[PDB]
Write a protein that binds this ligand. Sequence first.
Ligand SMILES: COc1ccccc1C(=O)Nc1cc2c(cc1N1CCCC1)n(C)c(=O)n2C
Length: 114
Amino acid sequence: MEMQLTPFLILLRKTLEQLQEKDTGNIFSEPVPLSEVPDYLDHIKKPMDFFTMKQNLEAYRYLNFDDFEEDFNLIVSNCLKYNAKDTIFYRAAVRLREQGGAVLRQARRQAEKM
Ligand SMILES: COc1ccccc1C(=O)Nc1cc2c(cc1N1CCCC1)n(C)c(=O)n2C
């Protein structure tokens, strides 16, 4: 149940903070702004960002590690999909994939101890 999951959610909260710290350009920490990118949903079926992941975490939407990891991976893959390779966005998503992936590998090991 939800109370039994408390330590797991504590682990996710810490992991999310570590992931969000990898957003050195501050471009993955709010939804892509549809006022400035009005075609974004034409292209991307499930937007994701670190603020939305925090909201999801606090709303009990992540009950296992895979579901959490899936949403992080969308932050990356949506950005690679929407943007051309020779963009600040694409390069930033590659950096995030690498650095965030290291965070997740360590965090998954700690989750396995639970
Ligand atoms: C606040 O963002 C903007 C303000 C003025 C003009 C343009 C933008 C803008 O394009 N923001 C933006 C585009 C993104 C994007 C993120 C942004 N924002 C998010 C907050 C600052 C930049 N990602 C991850 C993308 O893949 N795209 C295409």
